[PDB]
């Protein structure tokens, strides 16, 4: 029976498994850059490598710290002399740092979770990555619902023409200035201030990254002063159709900018207590520090909501509003003209082929969840703890089964707005009935 081998080996010498191993190598070199999906693909491919070649030099990973600091260097807060040569200056922005690696998902620094981005920004990033293969990742900044490319770190080419292409497909970019130097100019506070002024961007920048033409391992330089300013109140500001930013306010009226809700709650900002800020020339930037109080995560979220208002819930990086919710919210989430009833809505969805295709592909629960701007996992956790009475795909009656989810105030706020969610869900079930049935 040696027409069947003694212990049969696969076609692991073939060129297809060679390309699979090269994909494993390229994904291992960008293991910290990639999302959770490419990490799971890497783990499955390492399992394949152990199954075939009996030992692989790399190993399966469970948690990966998402850090692009290997392509960066330690930041300095002292004035320093710079070398002569060509230099490209790119501002580093205040908001949450995100990267778009070759896994075609939007990777978040510090947690590695894949963030949900709009379709036009996704298409522009895909066209940027398909135009130029040599880009390792696309560093982005999320603040005030604006996806802006802070930097485009690549090995071979400069980021200047990459930023020009990003301007071509519609990605928002900072102003690039190629300013050369002759002598060893001391990079002091005045030259940094006039450089930030010459950037001429109204968006909040925290530091400035200078780019060498032919040298990698790029450096960020930050000038700031640690300050401790007393706090009057925490006020919310409108940055979108339904969502809000936290903005913490001192006694004098200086607006200390907060990166996101997670930045506000990991530093444990309390009313009438001191906070750690990075003092700048114009803006005030809160430090990325951890609070030292004994108050837990749910209780600090609860007291932040109680100070802001009980009609607010945490939606990822931004707070959000609840209230009356009819056809206009579904209209603005369908990016079409205003509606008074179901019939005009379904007729103009029949007019709009792309909108009809998006209705067909997306489920009714996902559509109605995105209509009211709910978080994904938090709303799944809320629905998974309660029962429903359903007739003809419509929630005619709902009652809550587990009270233990209501200690989280975001879950309680979505449970308060669940009547409007039920109304909008009945509307979208009616729409899906009058289109595809």
């Amino acid at each position: 029976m040696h027409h069947h081998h003694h212990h049969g080996t696969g076609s692991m010498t073939s060129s297809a498994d060679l390309t699979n191993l090269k994909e494993l190598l390229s994904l291992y070199k960008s293991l910290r850059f990639s999302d959770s999906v490419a990490i799971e693909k890497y783990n499955s491919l390492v399992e394949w490598g152990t199954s075939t070649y009996w030992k692989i030099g790399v190993q399966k990973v469970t948690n990966v710290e998402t850090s692009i600091s290997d392509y960066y260097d330690e930041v300095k807060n002292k004035p320093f002399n710079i070398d002569p040569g060509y230099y490209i200056f790119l501002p580093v922005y205040f908001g949450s740092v995100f990267i778009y690696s070759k896994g075609k998902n939007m990777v978040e620094l510090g947690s590695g979770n894949s963030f949900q981005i709009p379709d036009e920004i996704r298409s522009a990033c895909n066209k940027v990555l398909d135009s130029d293969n040599g880009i390792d990742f696309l560093r982005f900044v999320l603040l005030n619902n604006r996806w802006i490319m802070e930097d485009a770190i690549s090995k071979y080419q400069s980021p200047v023409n990459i930023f020009k292409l990003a301007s071509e497909y519609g990605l928002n970019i900072p102003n690039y200035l190629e300013i050369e130097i002759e002598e060893d100019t001391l990079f002091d506070d005045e030259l940094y201030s006039i450089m930030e002024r010459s950037f001429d961007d109204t968006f909040p920048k925290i530091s400035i990254s200078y780019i060498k033409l032919g040298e990698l391992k790029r450096q960020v330089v930050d000038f700031f002063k640690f300050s401790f300013m007393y706090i009057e109140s925490i006020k919310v500001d409108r940055i979108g159709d339904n969502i809000f930013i936290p903005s913490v306010i001192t006694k004098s009226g200086k607006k200390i900018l907060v990166k996101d809700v997670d930045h506000l709650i990991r530093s444990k900002v309390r009313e009438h207590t001191f906070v750690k800020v990075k003092k700048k020339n114009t803006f005030s930037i809160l430090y990325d520090y951890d609070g030292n109080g004994t108050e837990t995560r749910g209780e600090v979220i609860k007291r932040i909501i109680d100070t802001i208002g009980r009609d607010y819930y945490v939606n990822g990086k931004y707070f959000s509003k609840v209230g009356i919710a009819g056809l206009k919210q579904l209209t603005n989430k369908l990016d079409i003209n205003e509606c008074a009833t179901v019939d005009e809505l379904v007729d103009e969805i029949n007019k709009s082929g792309t909108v009809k295709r998006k209705i067909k592909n997306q489920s009714v629960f996902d559509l109605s969840r995105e209509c009211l701007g709910y978080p994904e996992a938090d709303f799944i956790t809320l629905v998974n703890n309660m029962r429903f009475k359903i007739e003809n795909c419509k929630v005619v009656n709902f009652n809550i089964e587990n009270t233990n989810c209501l200690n989280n105030p975001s879950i309680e706020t979505i449970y308060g707005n669940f009547n409007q969610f039920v109304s909008i869900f009945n509307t979208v079930t009616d729409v899906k009935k009058r289109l595809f049935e």
Binding site: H6, T9, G57
Partner: protein, 218 residues
């Protein structure tokens, strides 16, 4: 570099300092297999059985493992042919020429490459026979290849039927490549790209890629 006594016909085994922890057991096995081995006219010269023991193992990171020497005109170094009449080393030269593009070569040698130790599993074969001295070289081959796979990172095996049990023959897990034999029909050694796979698997283990163009003889 180091030498131990042998009661039988080679009478001397020259080995490197990193080949030391297997030598007492290799002499123990050879002193019981050689009295029956040396009756047959071996394809390598019996003084050339252990040339590959004169090679260090720390600098080697990949091992090209054949099952036996060539049945005629055995040099004693695996896949070494100054005459270059052997078909197997001709297919190795063809595959490395497909890797590099270097088509103007007189011969090929896997011994001269940095990081490559060419290996015969069974260290000798009878003239005109394949796997003839397998029963003599079985435990010796298990011991010596276990030492190599403890030292090197990637194991490359030039036989599908011959090296099908290579995970049983080695006690420690190693990166093993059970590739097709160069003399195999249906052009399966022409089809596969195992040396590229060797290079990729070595960069997965943070090792230096093999300059395969070093093995060409001009």
């Amino acid at each position: 570099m180091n030498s131990v006594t042998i009661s039988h016909a080679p009478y001397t085994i020259t080995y490197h300092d990193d080949w030391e922890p297997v030598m007492s057991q290799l002499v123990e096995f050879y002193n019981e297999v050689a009295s029956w081995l040396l009756r047959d006219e071996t394809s390598p010269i019996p003084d050339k059985f252990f040339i590959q023991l004169k090679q260090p193992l720390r600098n080697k990171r990949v091992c090209v493992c054949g099952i036996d020497p060539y049945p005629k005109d055995g040099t004693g170094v695996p896949f070494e042919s100054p005459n270059f009449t052997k078909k197997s080393i001709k297919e190795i030269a063809s595959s490395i020429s497909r890797l590099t593009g270097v088509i103007d070569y007189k011969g090929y040698n896997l011994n001269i490459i940095d990081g490559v130790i060419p290996w015969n599993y069974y260290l000798s074969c009878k003239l005109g026979e394949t796997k003839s001295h397998a029963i003599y070289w079985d435990k010796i081959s298990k011991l010596l290849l276990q030492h190599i796979t403890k030292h090197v990172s990637v194991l490359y095996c030039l036989g599908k039927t011959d090296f099908s049990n290579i995970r049983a023959k080695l006690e420690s897990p190693v990166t093993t490549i059970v590739g097709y034999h160069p003399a195999a029909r249906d052009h399966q050694f022409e089809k596969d790209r195992s040396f590229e796979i060797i290079n990729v698997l070595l960069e997965l283990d943070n090792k230096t890629p093999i300059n395969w163009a070093q093995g060409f003889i001009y």
